[PDB]
Symmetry: C4
Subunit: 127 residues, 4 copies
């Protein structure tokens, strides 16, 4: 239906994941294990919102893929001023879609524990 | 040409919970979501009138009739229980439609009682 | 052309205009003389970005129409904490459109002087 | 489903002017705009690496070949001459296209000399 009202919806997110590297000298972006990107449906070059739970800072950047199985969350360049290694962050992407689709949309979510071990749900995660 | 328009909002409501343990979202009585047209998983802007902080997150439903506004997870560092917040969502549509668009608004009194 | 790349463009703006009212007790929004809205192509209920040149604060809200000829710029509710009467602000709206249109797009702009007297260009404006 | 993707960016460039008198925008050598695919009047995000400030504004053209980055008006309170900034724009497109999208990137050395 032309002219339909378009919603901004949570597409997917990495729930509390740990920052593994923060390097002011690599390009400003967040590099993320491709397995984690797959699970959250996040694309290389997609805009992402990062909330640093440890220090309260919130910022926007874009995603790049790190090696599958590396378990890397690298907050680089200018963003290395907003997160440090060991900080717990939340990484989310948002998409737009018409209202009827938005009403049944289910975001792609991944949870983490320990050594950035990825789970599908929060069931096994410590409090 | 596509415009960004106010879809709907909850005027001044009171934060009833701020649970750091829970996921980083804002949980809202489904009745309030229904009145404001805000969807579960929809991006929302929150303006905390009590402490000045503004931030973005997404909505999830709280129990219908509960009158809950819960600012949870990492968001709980932006609002405490008792703070007054404003919660809004925005939609896009072509200019032609935007010219006659009407947002969905809910007002509150007393203990998050919706003016009905 | 389906799947065409969509740009976010300055639709229009009120260049440095003076805040006339700031009232914590009216609804959080910015109320603007309808003549000024017309000149900038800004709509009632449209999302707007406000940059407060006087104090450096930047925030987002939505526009509502004040009486034609009132010359009102009223920053109300929660936004009254980001601007005061006498502050100089810039109010802008952004629209999206395909690339080819964006390449020839001309924003709708209004300039101000004195008692929120509106001009079409900066030519007559003091420095 | 529509994605928001990096359209293009100027990597670390140096601010050559910060003129408070001028309109609140960022003026950029047209050669740099050409390389990054950024348009006059397009929304841009600026990240000032030197002082940490991040803000949004819109691009306007500066004289071709001038190598100017000018952060003007109200924006001039977010960056001084000599600061290192990153300038980016974002576009939307359907998911199918987004999956193979490639941004337009320009790198710099010395005195805002584009690596060519």
């Amino acid at each position: 239906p032309r002219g339909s009202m378009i919603r901004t919806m949570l597409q997917g997110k990495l729930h509390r994941v740990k920052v593994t590297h923060a390097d002011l000298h690599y390009e400003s972006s967040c590099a993320i294990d491709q397995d984690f990107l797959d699970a959250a449906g996040i694309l290389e070059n997609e805009a992402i919102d990062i909330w640093n739970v440890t220090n309260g800072k919130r910022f926007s950047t874009y995603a790049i893929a790190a090696e599958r199985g590396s378990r890397i969350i690298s907050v680089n360049g200018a963003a290395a001023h907003c997160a440090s290694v060991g900080d717990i962050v939340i990484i989310a992407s948002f998409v737009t879609m018409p209202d009827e689709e938005a009403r049944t949309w289910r975001p792609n979510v991944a949870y983490f524990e320990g050594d950035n071990e990825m789970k599908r749900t929060a069931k096994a995660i410590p409090v």
